[PDB]
Design a protein around this ligand. Structure first.
Ligand SMILES: *[C@@H]1O[C@H](CO)[C@@H](O)[C@H](O)[C@H]1NC(C)=O
Lengths: 45, 49
């Protein structure tokens, strides 16, 4: 599972991911797992 | 080949380098973590007059 990231954004437009930026690897976790679905965790009230 | 100091930069994850046709043009050593470039030495042809 290789996770790529880029933090600094470009203020070309508002609330839209316009622009181009390459992504460099950060962590490659060698587990060997089978995954077909996934969820996401947020902050609830 | 012959090793000289490298004026190029490597990203932290990457360890090797090449330009065209699988020619290793640079490498980082595993101890100093320094960057070096590789170029072949001075082979050539000889002619007689
Ligand atoms: C290996 O040891 C040398 C001895 O000083 C040190 O300079 C170098 O950073 C070390 N490299 C690694 C990968 O531990």
């Amino acid at each position: 599972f290789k996770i790529y990231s880029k933090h600094t954004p470009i203020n070309l437009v508002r609330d839209l991911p316009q622009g181009f930026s390459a992504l460099e690897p950060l962590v490659d976790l060698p587990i060997g797992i089978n995954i077909t679905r996934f969820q996401t965790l947020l902050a609830l009230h | 080949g012959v090793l000289t100091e490298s004026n190029k930069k490597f990203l932290p994850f990457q360890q090797f380098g090449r330009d065209i046709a699988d020619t290793t043009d640079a490498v980082r050593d595993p101890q100093t973590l320094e960057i070096l470039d590789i170029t072949p030495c001075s082979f050539g042809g000889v002619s007689v007059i």
